[PDB]
Design a protein around this ligand. Sequence first.
Ligand code: HEM
Length: 153
Amino acid sequence: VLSEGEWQLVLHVWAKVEADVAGHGQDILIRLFKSHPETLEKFDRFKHLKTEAEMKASEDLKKHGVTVLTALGAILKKKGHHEAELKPLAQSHATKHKIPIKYLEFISEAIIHVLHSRHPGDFGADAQGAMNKALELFRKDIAAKYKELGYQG
Ligand code: HEM
């Protein structure tokens, strides 16, 4: 289900992301919070931000965007061989933050939306299919770790 060619498509669009990690991460989180506002409830100090301009001007939200894309990039670059990177993320998101897999689906949809909006010429059907499979693998593997930790979300 991911060939080496599909991993190259994932990593090619990822290189485009890496031209501006902060701006992509801001836009991904803003998209997630506008599409699925219940996710904001997990963030004590984004949940009171009243407007898109306030979210874009928040240095903390920008830093979070970088933290999320740095961890995800490190995972994608392993082309599936991501146990050591993914295990601690599962641990925190299951046991501390309590993030259900459906919220990982929502942020995956936000990732695809922003990548396509910013890079349509590098993110056609085949590259989208490859990224969807890579994100599905990430979510499948995190869900298995969730269960191993006793969290069934
Ligand atoms: C691609 C998916 C995601 C990645 C790679 C990611 C990555 C991270 C990283 C690296 C951290 C800091 C270290 C840690 O606590 O593990 C973190 C913190 C956290 N994440 Fe995620 N995350 C993802 C999705 C989500 C989603 C969808 C939510 C909420 C709807 C969420 C909620 C949180 C919370 C509440 C924290 C703690 C924030 C703080 O205390 O500053 N995460 N995440």
